[PDB]
Write a protein that binds this ligand. Structure first.
Ligand SMILES: Nc1ncnc2c1ncn2[C@@H]1O[C@H](COP(=O)(O)O)[C@@H](O)[C@H]1O
Length: 248
């Protein structure tokens, strides 16, 4: 039907209307990592420590709703340990959680294996938690060879998580440990350098960068601040779908 309907049926909401004109001009495609190149769901990739520590950690995390707490709880159930009764539980907002089991103070909190487990102030185990990447690569390579598109990846994630993923999809140019303010500035430079930037984002740390892109795409599973500022919503959460469109 109408162009809007065609796109919607392609899995794309076009909030803008001028965006088509804008797309022919784009020469730089920037991906925010989290929830764009990956699902937005943290998993335990590794636990270091024993099963008693695992049980303690999950028992305490069972009382939090944070995605990380959930991922630990889920990992432990899969190992087959059961949830223990916790007393004097406390979330902290910044660090993590705390609680008392069998006369032992248990804390599960961040660190830098970012997540540590402390039994009576002594770090006893840790979790390495990370994301699940979306299936694909060729799609992106079709971009590289499509037009002469430069592809950049950005995230507030650590240089280890980002380097690994960029190695994976074969992107040379990426930047890690970035705050929104950093991202705004990188895009700023690019636009000042005369580049036309299309950016795909998803979630809190992407909104301000997206608002500043020449054309902006938010993911379907993306947060509201991101979507109310995006030119396009990939309600399909299917990047490939968006790719094709870039193949004008
Ligand atoms: N329930 C939790 N268990 C362990 N660590 C947490 C928890 N909640 C927050 N954190 C830590 O706090 C950081 C930032 O939290 P957030 O700002 O809410 O995403 C996370 O990356 C974790 O290191």
């Amino acid at each position: 039907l109408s162009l809007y309907e065609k796109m919607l049926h392609k899995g794309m909401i076009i909030k803008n209307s001028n965006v088509y004109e804008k797309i022919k001009e784009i020469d730089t495609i920037i991906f925010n990592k989290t929830g764009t190149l990956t699902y937005g769901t943290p998993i335990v990739t590794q636990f270091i420590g024993d099963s008693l520590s695992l049980a303690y950690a999950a028992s305490v995390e069972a009382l939090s709703s944070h995605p990380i707490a959930k991922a630990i709880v889920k990992y432990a159930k899969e190992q087959g340990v059961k949830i223990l009764e916790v007393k004097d539980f406390k979330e902290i907002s910044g660090i993590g959680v705390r609680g008392k089991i069998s006369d032992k103070i248990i804390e599960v909190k961040k660190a830098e294996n970012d997540i540590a487990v402390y039994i009576n102030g002594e770090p006893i185990a840790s979790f390495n938690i990370s994301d699940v990447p979306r299936p694909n690569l060729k799609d992106y390579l079709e971009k590289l060879k499509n037009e002469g598109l430069k592809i950049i990846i950005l995230s507030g994630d650590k240089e280890d998580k980002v380097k690994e993923l960029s190695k994976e999809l074969n992107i040379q140019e990426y930047y890690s440990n970035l705050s929104p303010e950093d991202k705004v500035r990188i895009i700023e430079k690019l636009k000042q350098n005369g580049n036309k930037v299309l950016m795909i984002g998803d979630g809190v740390n992407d909104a301000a960068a997206l608002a500043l892109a020449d054309v902006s795409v938010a993911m379907g599973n993306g947060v509201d601040i991101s979507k109310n500022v995006a030119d396009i919503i990939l309600v399909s959460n299917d990047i490939g779908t968006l790719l094709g469109l870039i193949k004008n």
